[PDB]
Design a protein around this ligand. Structure first.
Ligand SMILES: OCCC(CCO)C(CO)(CO)CO
Ligand SMILES: [Cl-]
Ligand SMILES: [Mg+2]
Ligand SMILES: [Mg+2]
Ligand SMILES: [Mg+2]
Ligand SMILES: [Mg+2]
Lengths: 228, 228
C-alpha cells in the first residue's frame, strides 16, 4: 500500500518551482481562521528512512479543547523528489495527503512541523498542503532556518516578527517562560494572531506543540514497523 | 508545591507595561462568546496573605445549565510582582494559570472577579488571562473602580453604560432588584451583550455571580490551610 510518485509529479527543479509559483496564488492570507480550544486540531510530521527511498507520514487528530487524541493515521510512500533545499515538500506531500486521507474524520486545523509562508518562495510545506487540501494550516518550527528575529519578551505569549530580509514571514513565539521560542508561520486560511493562539493553546506544558510531539512519535514508530 | 515566579516574568513596571501593550492588540472583541446555559462556566478568584508574600488561586467549574459544581482546583504561589495600580494582575496570573491547569476539564468560559477591558490601560485580569489561555473570558466587579455610570433601572436585568471618559468599557448591571449593580466588562472572545447575559444567568438569587462566590470561598479556605 506504498504511496507511489503521483502521475506527472515534477521531475526537475524548474518544474517544481513553477508549481510553487502557480499554486501560491491560491493561498488565502486574510481569513482569520478557527479559534483555539474548539473543534479538531491535527499534527502532521514525517520520518525519512536512511536505507531505502521511503518516507512515512503521520497525522494525529486532537480534540482542541482537551488535547486528547481522537484519531490517527500513517502512510508509507516513495520519496517523490530529490533532495533540493527550497523544494523539500515535493518529497513528502503525496504521502502526507495519504495519511490525512486515511483519517476517519476531518483534521480541522493542520499544524505542520515546519514552515508555511516563511519560505524562500513563500510556499513551504504548510502553505503547499493548505492549498492542495483547501484546509486551514499553519507551521510551527523548532529553529528559525535562515530568518532573523529580535528576542521576543521573556514571558510565555510574547512574540516578535520573524523576518526574511526585511519582510515579516512569521513570528518567534515564546511558548514557555524563559525558554527558547518556536517559529510560527501561516500556511493557509489562518492569520498570524490565530496561528499564535493555536500554538499557545497546544503548548501549555511543553515548548513544542502537542500535535508535533504526537505526530513525530507516530511517524517514527510507523517507519520502524515498515522497515521491519 | 508552591508556584514560583515564572523564569522570565516582568520585574519592572516598564516590562509589565510592555507585556500589556503587546498582548492588548490580541484581545478579541468581535466574537459573541458561548451561548448562556450551555457547556461549562468557570469562576476564578484569589486570596492574598498579609503576613507571607503568597497568593492562593481557585478555579471552580460549574455546569452552565444548573450551576452545579463539577470541578475544582487551587494553587498556592509566590506573589510575582510588587503592588502597582494598573499592573495588579502581574501578581497573581502565574498562580491562577496553575489552578486552571490543574482542572480535569476545559473551563468553557472564565468569569473573573475583576475587570477585562475596563482597565486603566484596557487590559485587565480577564483580558490578560484570555490572551494567555485563548479562552473566552469576562470580568464581573463589585465596584466601578474610577469609571462613571448612571444608575441602571430598578428591575433585575436593567443595565447602563460604564464609561471611561466618554468610551464605554462595560456596563453597570442590575443582577437583583433593590440591590446595587455589579460591573461587567468584556475580557476576551465575548461581547458585552453576552457578558451581561452570562452574568444574569449566574445570579438567579444573589447579587454576586455564583462562579465568584464559589471561587472566593475556595481560595480563602485554601489560603488558611496553606499558612496553617
Ligand atoms: O482543557 C485542557 C487544557 C486546560 C487545562 C485544564 O482546564 C487549559 C486551562 O487554561 C485550557 O483550557 C490549558 O492548561
Ligand atoms: Cl522547502
Ligand atoms: Mg519532523
Ligand atoms: Mg519529526
Ligand atoms: Mg476577588
Ligand atoms: Mg475574593
Amino acid at each position: 500500500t506504498t504511496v507511489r510518485i503521483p502521475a506527472g509529479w515534477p521531475a526537475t527543479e524548474e518544474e517544481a518551482r513553477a508549481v510553487q509559483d502557480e499554486l501560491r496564488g491560491r493561498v488565502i492570507l486574510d481569513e482569520p481562521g478557527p479559534p483555539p480550544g474548539t473543534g479538531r486540531v491535527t499534527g502532521v510530521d514525517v520520518a525519512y528512512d536512511d536505507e531505502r527511498d521511503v518516507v512515512v507520514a503521520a497525522a494525529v487528530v486532537l480534540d482542541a479543547a482537551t488535547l486528547d487524541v481522537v484519531a490517527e493515521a500513517t502512510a508509507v510512500g516513495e520519496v517523490s523528489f530529490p533532495y533540493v533545499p527550497g523544494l523539500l515538500a515535493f518529497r513528502e506531500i503525496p504521502t502526507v495527503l495519504a495519511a490525512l486521507d486515511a483519517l476517519p474524520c476531518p483534521p480541522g486545523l493542520i499544524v505542520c512541523d515546519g514552515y508555511g509562508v516563511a519560505h524562500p518562495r513563500r510556499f513551504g510545506l504548510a502553505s503547499h498542503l493548505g492549498v492542495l487540501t483547501g484546509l486551514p494550516t499553519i507551521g510551527v518550527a523548532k529553529n528559525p532556518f535562515t530568518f532573523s528575529y529580535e528576542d521576543p519578551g521573556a514571558p510565555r505569549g510574547s512574540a516578535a516578527p520573524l523576518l526574511a530580509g526585511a519582510d515579516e514571514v512569521g513570528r518567534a513565539l515564546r511558548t514557555q517562560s524563559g525558554v527558547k521560542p518556536v517559529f510560527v508561520s501561516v500556511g493557509h486560511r489562518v492569520d498570524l494572531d490565530h496561528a499564535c493562539a493555536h500554538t499557545l493553546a497546544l503548548t501549555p506544558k511543553y515548548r513544542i506543540p502537542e500535535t508535533t510531539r504526537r505526530a513525530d512519535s507516530l511517524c517514527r514508530r510507523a517507519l520502524k514497523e515498515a522497515t521491519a
